[PDB]
Design a protein around this ligand. Structure first.
Ligand SMILES: [Mg+2]
Ligand SMILES: [Mg+2]
Ligand SMILES: [Mg+2]
Ligand SMILES: [Mg+2]
Ligand SMILES: [Mg+2]
Ligand SMILES: [Mg+2]
Ligand SMILES: [Mg+2]
Ligand SMILES: [Mg+2]
Ligand SMILES: [Mg+2]
Ligand SMILES: [Mg+2]
Ligand SMILES: [Mg+2]
Ligand SMILES: [Mg+2]
Ligand SMILES: [Mg+2]
Ligand SMILES: [Mg+2]
Ligand SMILES: [Mg+2]
Ligand SMILES: [Mg+2]
Lengths: 123, 205, 151, 80, 82, 129, 156
RNA sequence: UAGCUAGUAGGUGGGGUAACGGCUCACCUAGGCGACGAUCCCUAGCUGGUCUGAGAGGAUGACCAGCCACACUGGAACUGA
RNA sequence: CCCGCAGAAGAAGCACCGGCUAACUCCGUGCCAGCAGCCGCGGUAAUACGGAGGGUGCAAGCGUUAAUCGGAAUUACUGGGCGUAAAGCGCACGCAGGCGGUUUGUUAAGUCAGAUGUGAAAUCCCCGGGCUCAACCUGGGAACUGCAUCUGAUACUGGCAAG
């Protein structure tokens, strides 16, 4: 790695392969679920993971975790998706937004409702 | 854009006086100044250096009333100047118009003084001004507009100012309710509880 | 072959049947991940939440009567736009839609083609590939999917 | 005072013109190591009077061909 | 042609004029040749709003530059200003 | 192949002061002498001397203050593999001016301080400390 | 009139025939705020002991650095056990801009204005193993003058 | 992506142009380019700057200013400074 | 912009409180679920899920995602490595290339110094000025690290000559 080697070959740098390819820098994308399904983990861990196969406007079909506590989705349900990766899910790099575009407004939540679209309940 | 909750909770949180009430009474008479607010406010937590830094920043903010974003502006400008940054930071913090009025004892609490500025009661160098964050220059002469020179609050605050230490850099005349910002106050001219070096350290994270 | 998929079918069919739900395809994949995928058919509709209901009940009957001793992973699924058809009856229900299929044999001239169903028989399914009404034995088909196209 | 360059011919296979190669010693932009770079040219060799290697001296002129824009002005060594 | 005119600067409802010279074909705030002063309509005696390097101007109009009537007035002022 | 005499000369001091020798010597050269002379009067050594004619050798009396060599860190900056030149204003400072940077100028070889006194850039040869 | 500061505490294991036996290693520095400082590190069965004994060794080993005015006298780096630490004096009132581990070391010594940065691994014991050495390797404007046999301005 | 090029490289003459010029043509010469990356391929308007960074750099060229390019697609010219 | 009027009268929210990371308990809660930037969390009690109280931060905003740099010395010119962690070609010869002992002369290319031209304006920066402050606008300067040219300097490197 001497200078005379740099002049004959400058230092390179590998590109930043986007962990969220199906977004193409779009902060969100609209999509239609082409399948709905849940998956339990191995014998030791018992849990249910909500997730949909969804075709995007760009043409990609991906997997997006269903935020949970709102489940009104089925084949041909449009939905807006954002790039969020949950641990314990192998291919889920996207989270369905909760609170817009054909997603049920979750039942009343007194805390952190904005992250679910629940409006401030007017007592 | 101004904090409007209870006052003493801050002092009880920052564990010291902040001159948030007129001062006719002692703090303990009005609160548990020795103990933090809230259910768990009695127990003494094991904080961190970072916690120290934050807690000192929130102090000087709260003792002056600058919100966050407006504050670091003062800092980000204070660092740009010459001399000891954290030093001159306080210096310009001592330059806020309201604070000067408060220092001049026209207002018991700074908020009370701030309300005066906001309520168009003070003229710097003969001309009216109503922005509280209006910086001031040496030799400037603030004053009271006659529409308020007869206000009950201004005379009572003047009767409360001499109960506290007469500032040096700025000189007042309570006779006609107008004073002179002669000199830019120095670091020593302020208190000593303030640790400006850690205030810089915080934003320098 | 069939990893005693017969028992898998009965074990899943019972709770699913109890749910008033119809069962369509059972598939298990070992090695890559011992995960089982189930295709269900609810006429009213199939939300994920219901898939959770059946996932719990089937998990329950699966737990006691499971002697395969593979890793315990299995997902519940509802037919995708591209949905596999396993029964002759399934071919019958999709009278006139495109279905892709691949022959089990990898010999040359294998039926790796898609067609549109014209007629449905038990052993033989008529699908139109290259303008020809071909008939296929479903047992000799490795895997087949219907209408991968979204309209 | 006219400007001029002092290169060194590398070819004269063409009628009354030559291919001078200049040599500029330049420091690398980033790596700081000095380097030598050449700039070939197409100089009008009036009279066809330069061999190979013979270091010459040129001068910039109006275009004379698709390529040439340089006139020879002298020879400072004749190709030993 | 080559003229001496006013490019508009400052902000909305608070305009500021840089008196420059430029080919007339160029936009009011496009390129120019030699900024030769400024104009401030809203000076109000707070600060000078008319500084001119009229000799440089004189040099320009001397060699065929023409004058916007506004600055033509402005020039008249500084002469009256003396 | 010894493609640098100066670096060698320096290491001969570093590996010299380290080995705690009383004195070290090199095949001399009109340059090294100039290199020595400046640091010599700069207290970093006691004295040098050169003898011999066909193969003159330079010989240096190393220094130690308190069981510790006076000079302790030596590094040739402008090296054959990569040269270095600095203008007047950008003349470096060694250990905030406690160290010394030996630079050659058209006016010869001297410390960095003397250079920015005369206001002459040049080629930075070594940092001494 | 000293000044102390814990740095880090780890729970280390030790596997015995039956299971293991945890322990606790403390790590701390002690300085006089006047360019004189040492550090200590000692294991124990439980935290206060470790924090106590390690605190005491640091009362020895207190080297005396020749800083000037809460700041160093020249940039300086120090590399120990795979950890590299660059430091350099800073302007007046700049403060102590340094990673966590170093900040205390700089603090208790008496430094007020210093830039700093670590490199490589950031194991706390290593960087202080790598910092105090860097500190003592400073040189007064007369330590040179002495060792160079000159007057102060003769170098300055 | 290793060879590339025959108006190609050069000269002579004529034509042509507001102007120099394979600009064009005749003619002659057989060159010219390339590892200091020719050729090919993908991508892209460029810059002042902008964001970041302690710095060196990295990123970027929205707004504003300079320059270029284009005006359904393709081609051609006319008029005219 | 000013003056007058009435009346506290018309005007506060959003995240978060296991650690990182400032800020904690109660009750459900049952590994059902749900939470999640990572590490992780959940049982008969969970300061990590839900509600509640309390608290922290920020504020006409507050969070999430995206994108870029930074942190990253993680392409290491500044500023990394290669015995075993990834990394010395199986070995050799050798062209191009890179690099080169020592003395003198010469050259002035590199190099350095100086001058001169240029490096648009805006922008950034310093000192001002003006909008009541600020943002904003503006004077002047600095700077634009560049390039070219001229005149010098000769230690260094190169060229030439002679050793
Ligand atoms: Mg605001
Ligand atoms: Mg905490
Ligand atoms: Mg001709
Ligand atoms: Mg002719
Ligand atoms: Mg960096
Ligand atoms: Mg635009
Ligand atoms: Mg015409
Ligand atoms: Mg980097
Ligand atoms: Mg490495
Ligand atoms: Mg090998
Ligand atoms: Mg060999
Ligand atoms: Mg050579
Ligand atoms: Mg040599
Ligand atoms: Mg400019
Ligand atoms: Mg002003
Ligand atoms: Mg020579």
């Amino acid at each position: 790695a001497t200078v005379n080697q740099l002049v004959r070959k400058p230092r390179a740098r590998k590109v930043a392969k986007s962990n969220v390819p199906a977004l193409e820098a779009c902060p969100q994308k609209r999509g239609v679920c082409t399948r709905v399904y849940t998956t339990t983990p191995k014998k030791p861990n018992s849990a249910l993971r909500k997730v949909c196969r969804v075709r995007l406007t760009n043409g990609f079909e991906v997997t997006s975790y269903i935020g949970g506590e709102g489940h009104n989705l089925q084949e041909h349900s449009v939905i807006l998706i954002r790039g969020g990766r949950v641990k314990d899910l192998p291919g889920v790099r996207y989270h369905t937004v909760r609170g817009a575009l054909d997603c049920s407004g979750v039942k009343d939540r007194k805390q952190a409702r904005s992250k679910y679209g629940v409006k401030r309940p007017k007592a | 854009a101004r904090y409007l909750g209870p006052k003493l909770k801050l002092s009880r949180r920052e564990g010291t006086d902040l001159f948030l009430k007129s001062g006719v009474r002692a703090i303990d008479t009005k609160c548990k100044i020795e103990q933090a607010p809230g259910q768990h406010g009695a127990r003494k937590p094991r904080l961190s250096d970072y916690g120290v830094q934050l807690r000192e920043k929130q102090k000087v903010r709260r003792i002056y009333g600058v919100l966050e974003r407006q504050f670091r502006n003062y800092y980000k400008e204070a660092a740009r100047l010459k001399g000891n940054t954290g030093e001159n930071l306080l210096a310009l913090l001592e330059g806020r118009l309201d604070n000067v009025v408060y220092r001049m004892g026209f207002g018991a609490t700074r908020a009370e003084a701030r309300q005066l500025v906001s309520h168009k009661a003070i003229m710097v160098n003969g001309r009216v001004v109503n922005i509280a964050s209006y910086q001031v220059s040496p030799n400037d002469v603030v004053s009271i507009r006659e529409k308020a020179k007869k206000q009950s609050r201004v005379k009572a605050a003047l009767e409360l100012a001499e109960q506290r230490e007469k500032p040096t850099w700025l000189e007042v005349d309570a006779g006609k309710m107008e004073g002179t910002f002669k000199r830019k106050p120095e670091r020593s001219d302020l208190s000593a509880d303030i640790n400006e070096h850690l205030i810089v350290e915080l934003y320098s994270k | 072959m069939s990893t005693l998929e017969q028992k898998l079918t009965e074990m899943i069919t019972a709770p699913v049947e109890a749910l008033g739900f119809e069962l369509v395809g059972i598939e298990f994949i070992r090695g890559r991940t011992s995960t089982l995928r189930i295709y269900i058919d609810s006429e009213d509709g199939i939300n994920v939440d219901d898939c959770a209901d059946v996932s719990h009940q089937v998990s329950a009957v699966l737990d006691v009567e499971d002697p395969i001793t593979v890793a315990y992973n299995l997902e519940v699924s509802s037919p995708g736009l591209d949905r596999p058809l396993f029964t002759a009856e399934h071919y019958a229900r999709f009278v006139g839609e495109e279905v892709t299929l691949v022959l089990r044999m990898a010999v040359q001239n294998r039926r790796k083609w898609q067609g549109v169903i014209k007629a449905v028989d038990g052993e033989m399914i008529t699908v139109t590939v290259e303008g020809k009404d071909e008939v296929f034995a479903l047992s000799n088909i490795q895997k087949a999917n219907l209408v991968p196209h979204f309209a | 005072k006219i400007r001029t360059l002092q290169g060194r011919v590398v070819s004269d296979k063409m009628e009354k013109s030559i291919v001078v190669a200049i040599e500029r010693f330049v420091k690398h932009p980033i790596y700081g190591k000095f380097i030598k770079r050449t700039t070939k040219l197409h100089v009008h060799d009036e009279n066809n009077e330069c061999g190979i290697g013979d270091v010459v001296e040129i001068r910039e002129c109006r275009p004379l061909s698709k390529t040439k824009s340089w006139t020879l002005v002298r020879v400072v060594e004749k190709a030993v | 042609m080559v003229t001496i005119r006013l490019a508009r600067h400052g902000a909305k409802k608070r305009p500021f004029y840089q008196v420059v010279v430029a080919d007339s074909r160029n936009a009011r705030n496009g390129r120019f040749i030699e900024r030769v002063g400024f104009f401030n309509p809203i000076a109000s005696e707070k600060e000078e709003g008319t500084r001119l390097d009229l000799d440089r101007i004189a040099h320009w109009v001397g060699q065929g530059a023409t004058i916007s009537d506004r600055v033509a007035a402005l020039i008249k002022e500084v002469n009256k200003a003396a | 192949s010894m493609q640098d005499p100066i670096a060698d000369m320096l290491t001969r001091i570093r590996n010299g002061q380290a080995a705690n020798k009383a004195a070290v010597t090199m095949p001399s050269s009109k340059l090294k002498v100039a290199i020595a002379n400046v640091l010599k009067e700069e207290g970093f050594i006691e004295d040098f001397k050169v003898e011999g004619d066909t193969k003159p050798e330079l010989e240096l009396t190393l220094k130690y203050f308190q069981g510790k060599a006076v000079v302790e860190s030596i590094q040739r900056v402008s090296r054959p593999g990569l040269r270095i030149y600095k203008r007047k204003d950008e003349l470096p400072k060694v250990m905030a001016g406690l160290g010394i940077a030996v630079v050659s100028t058209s006016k010869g070889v001297m410390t960095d301080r003397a250079a920015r006194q005369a206001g002459l850039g040049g080629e930075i040869i070594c940092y001494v400390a | 009139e000293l000044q102390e500061k814990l740095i880090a505490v780890n729970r280390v294991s030790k596997t015995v025939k039956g299971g293991r036996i945890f322990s606790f290693t403390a790590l701390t520095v002690v300085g006089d705020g006047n360019g004189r400082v040492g550090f200590g590190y000692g294991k124990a069965r439980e935290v206060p002991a470790a924090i106590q004994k390690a605190m005491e060794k640091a009362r020895r080993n207190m080297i005396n650095v020749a800083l000037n005015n809460g700041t160093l006298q020249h940039p300086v780096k120090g590399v120990h056990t795979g950890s590299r630490v660059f430091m350099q004096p800073a302007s007046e009132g700049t403060g102590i801009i340094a990673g966590g581990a170093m900040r205390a070391v700089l603090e208790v010594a008496g430094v007020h204005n210093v830039l700093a940065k670590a490199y490589g691994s950031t194991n706390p014991i290593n960087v202080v193993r790598a910092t105090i050495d860097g500190l003592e390797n400073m040189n007064s404007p007369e330590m040179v003058a002495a060792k160079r046999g000159k007057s102060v301005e003769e170098i300055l």
